[PDB]
Amino acid sequence: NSAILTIQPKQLPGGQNPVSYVYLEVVSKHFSKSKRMPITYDNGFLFIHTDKPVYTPDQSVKVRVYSLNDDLKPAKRETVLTFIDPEGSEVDMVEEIDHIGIISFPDFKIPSNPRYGMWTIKAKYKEDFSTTGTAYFEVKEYVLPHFSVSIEPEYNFIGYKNFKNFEITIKARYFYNKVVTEADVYITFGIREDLKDDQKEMMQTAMQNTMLINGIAQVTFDSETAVKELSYYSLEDLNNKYLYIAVTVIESTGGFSEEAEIPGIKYVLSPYKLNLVATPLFLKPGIPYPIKVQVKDSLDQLVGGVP
Amino acid sequence: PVPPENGFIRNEKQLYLVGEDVEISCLTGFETVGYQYFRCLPDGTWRQ
Amino acid sequence: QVHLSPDADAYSPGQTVSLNMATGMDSWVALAAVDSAVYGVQRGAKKPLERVFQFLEKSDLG
Amino acid sequence: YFPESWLWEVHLVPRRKQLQFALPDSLTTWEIQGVGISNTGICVADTVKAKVFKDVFLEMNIPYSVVRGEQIQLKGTVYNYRTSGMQFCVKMSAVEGICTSESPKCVRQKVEGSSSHLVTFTVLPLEIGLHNINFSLETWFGKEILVKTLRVVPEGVKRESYS
Amino acid sequence: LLEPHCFPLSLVPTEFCPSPPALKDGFVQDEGTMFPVGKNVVYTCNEGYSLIGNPVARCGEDLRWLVGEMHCQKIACVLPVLMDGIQSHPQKPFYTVGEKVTVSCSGGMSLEGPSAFLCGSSLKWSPEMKNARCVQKENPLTQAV
Ligand SMILES: *[C@@H]1O[C@H](CO)[C@@H](O[C@@H]2O[C@H](CO)[C@@H](O[C@@H]3O[C@H](CO)[C@@H](O)[C@H](O)[C@@H]3O)[C@H](O)[C@H]2NC(C)=O)[C@H](O)[C@H]1NC(C)=O
């Protein structure tokens, strides 16, 4: 059989500190035991939907939040919404009753000169619950792009298979789902010490132009030829480091000049690091036992066809 | 943080959280020109 | 499941159009709209409710 | 209209319900995401995609904000998805918080079929805040009005200060 | 009290609350023939309502429910006090969720503020104003000669 039970959220003796443990007891005709089961004020879910993932200054972040039990029924609990700066300080707490089973909030008009960066929404239930589902939005000075630009190689790394010739797609589409007809493209190549941060420079020669036509262009970096001519890294044995590739696309008769980047071209000694995928690490004699593994480039994507 | 010349930390802790703040001001002969708190940034600095 | 009931490849400036929200039970619904160019500026940004089923899976205690 | 987002709403639906709206002047895929809350769970719909797309239209590369008292280039374009090439024009008109050389009339240059053409307008934003600007295409067959909005900020070094 | 299962048990209860009180426009989310002392019930208000306060009833001491503060509110933006004799036109007893409402002064008067409010936040007007002008000086200097 099953009971459905709960800690009733108001009935905890509560106050300034939480009750961190509880007992679960059975009293049958034949047996009793307690056991110190934990409890958590992390109940149900909070999911936070922002009318954009990005904003400028002089906008209002118009959040709505979706509040649900672990039954995934809507919760109908009063809720308070903790806007956090990029600098980790709290900047607002605003409250609304979960009356629908969904919770709008007043727009939180961007404070008059904001700290740019990833602000955050620690949506807190008021009253008993700690659940603190959390979501993110970034204040940036911007105009919306005219077209999408994307970059696609097979490997996302430079190493033994390709250091002499690393080979990559530059592609672009209008946001009305049509290929960019013609665009001039510059490729920047720069050695980079890490994915985190540096101010390292570009290749002064063995930079590359390409043409984008019918939405696509191709690029081939002879990374040995550049590195051995311009750089310290003369041997393929030297590095677990990075190439910054950055792609500027200018529409060839259109005046819009979008740009994108991939820090994810590793110079690597051992590109194909591995993990198990679904393998429990427990056996069964007499039933054939699977294994599954996967392989990760740096700035990881699944590498595709590898022996 | 070590407070400035002739200075004194008002609220004393081992470890201040990110976004948490400390108040300072000069000793009995003296007065602060400027804003007399500092706040722990996410990288572990005080930007004094 | 949602569709614009004037089913078309393309529409035009100032055009009125109807949206219909076929739903298998009595339900609330919450519409939101964005220019795709909004995803073009924040590199690698997820959809604002992307993989709701995966976040909903983080509640698995195993 | 020219929005980044709109249609921010909540409703209760009988097993079908319908809502009607004017598609905005933003000529891009409006991608429309609908989230259903009821006793069985949450859902997010397979995102509907709709395209605001016309055979001929103008668009303008205007930056996010500009220095009061500095002149800059705004770069214009026509897109022409008609099967053939055609002569076109363009004009600009805005509030007196802007000044210009462009004296609002073209040489009437041609854009090819399935093709785009470049344009330039030179302006000095002269007052701050928001200026509404109309860019207008002044051409045969398919034609458009753009209304576009430009932020302006002061010419000097930013400092923050406290107490 | 420590080790109950060592003893006989009447594990079936013999002390009870009477059935919980009903509410206007809501119901007890639980149902049964009796509720034993210290068994809870929870309330839910019916379609188009949010239960304000605490929905949980105790079955506490003296066999009384100790229901606590609770109220069924119908989820409409019921209009607050207007501005300056400026009127909401699509009047209803309960403005429906997401219902776009349009607002104006009496004719010819120099009105101020936005034209509309939308109840998309279903208990608070999405934009709002607390005070705005209906009218102004509508007659300039004339015949300066
Ligand atoms: C730039 O384009 C805009 C369109 O956004 C032009 O605004 C338009 O201006 C006209 C005349 O001022 C408005 O006409 C109006 O007709 C209504 C009829 O009810 C009347 O009530 C108004 O008093 C007015 O006469 C039109 O609505 C308005 N369009 C909107 C919605 O903005 C603007 O004139 C052009 N700007 C330039 C370059 O001056």
List chain D gaps (C–N > 2.5 A) by preceding residue: 104
Instruction: Give the total residue count for chain D.
Output: 163
Residue pair A83/A106 in contact by the 8 Å Cβ criterion: no
Report the C-alpha gap between D117 and D85 in whole angstroms. 11
Residue whose C-alpha is closest to residue D57's, from D123, D140, D143: D143
Candidate of D26, D95, D102, D132 to mutate for ligand 1, largest count of ligand atoms within 8 Å of Cβ: D132
Pocket test for ligand 1, best of D90, D91, D96, D147 (most atoms within 8 A of CB): D147
Whole-number CA gyration radius for chain B: 11
Q: Which of A238, A261, A236 is nearest to A168 (CA)?
A: A261
What's the rounded Cα separation, in Å, for the pair A69 and A45? 6
Q: Which residues of D touch A100 (CB under 8 A)?
A: 10, 37
**Closest C-alpha residue for ligand 1 atom 1:** D134
Q: Say if residue A195 is in the same domain as residue A125.
A: no
Q: How far apart are CA B24 and CA B10, in angstroms?
A: 6
Question: After which residues is chain A discontinuous, taking C to N > 2.5 Å?
Answer: none
| DSSP reduced 3-state for E44 | strand
Determine the residue among A37, A42, A49 to mutate to test chain C binding: the one whose Cβ has the most chain C Cβ atoms within 10 Å: A49
Hunting for tokens 């969904």 — which residue is that? Answer: A102
Cα(A100)–Cα(A48) distance, rounded to whole angstroms? 15
The widest CA-to-CA distance across chain E, in whole angstroms, is 112
Cβ < 6 A, ligand 1 pocket? D 93, 134, 145, 147
Helix/strand/coil percent split, chain D, to 5 = 0, 55, 45
Question: Torsion angle, CA of B22/A120/D151/D74, rounded to 10 degrees?
Answer: 130
Q: What is the CATH number of the domain that holds A63?
A: 2.60.40.1930
State whether A128 and A223 are in the same domain.
Answer: no
Q: Which residue of B has its CA nearest to A90?
A: B19
E78 touches chain A (CB under 8 A): no
| A92 and A158 housed in the same domain | no
Experimental method: cryo-EM
Distance, in Å, from the CA atom of E107 to the CA atom of E13, rounded to the nearest integer, reads: 71
Q: What is the domain-level CATH number for residue A260?
A: 2.60.40.1940
Same domain, A118 and A190: no
Nearest C-alpha of chain D: how many angstroms from B13?
23
Contact assessment for residue A240 and residue A261, using Cβ atoms and an 8 Å cutoff: no
d(CA E10, CA E17): 18
Chains in contact with E via at least 3 Cβ–Cβ pairs below 8 Å: A, D
> Kind and range of the H or E element at C37?
helix C37-41
Output the DSSP codes for A117-135: EEEEEEEEESTT-----EE
Statement to judge: residues A120 and A175 lie in one domain = no
For ligand 1, the distance from its centroid to the CA atom of residue C18, given in whole angstroms, is 26
Burial of E114 (0-12, 13-18, 19+ CB in 10 A): exposed
Q: Whose Cα sits closest to atom 38 in ligand 1? A: D93
Q: Is B39 an 8 Å CB contact of chain A?
A: yes
Which positions in chain E have a beta carbon within 8 angstroms of at least one beta carbon in chain D? 48, 97-98, 118, 120-122
What subunits touch chain C, counting only 3 or more CB pairs under 8 A? Answer: A, D
A163 and A254 in a common domain: yes
Tell if the CB–CB gap between E97 and D12 is shorter than 8 Å.
yes
| Bridge partners for B17 per DSSP | none
CA distance A50 to D33: 12
Burial code (b: 16+ CB inside 10 Å, e: under 16) for D6-33 equals bbbbbbbbeeeeebebebbbbbbbbbbb
User: In this structure, are A76 and A160 located in the same domain?
Assistant: no
- A155, A134: one domain: no
Query: What residues make up the domain containing A185?
Result: 147-267
Find all residues with CB under 8 Å of A111, minimum gap 6, and list them: A91
Q: Which residues of B fall within a CB distance of 8 Å from D162?
A: 34-35
Indicate if A174 and A225 belong to the same structural domain: yes
Q: What is the CATH number of the domain that holds E22?
A: 2.10.70.10
Contact E85, E113 (CB under 8 A): no
Which residue range forms the structural domain that includes residue E28?
16-74
Taking a C-beta distance cutoff of 8 angstroms, is the pair A145, C40 a contact?
yes
Q: Does A87 touch chain B (CB under 8 A)?
A: yes
> A157 and A234 share a domain?
yes
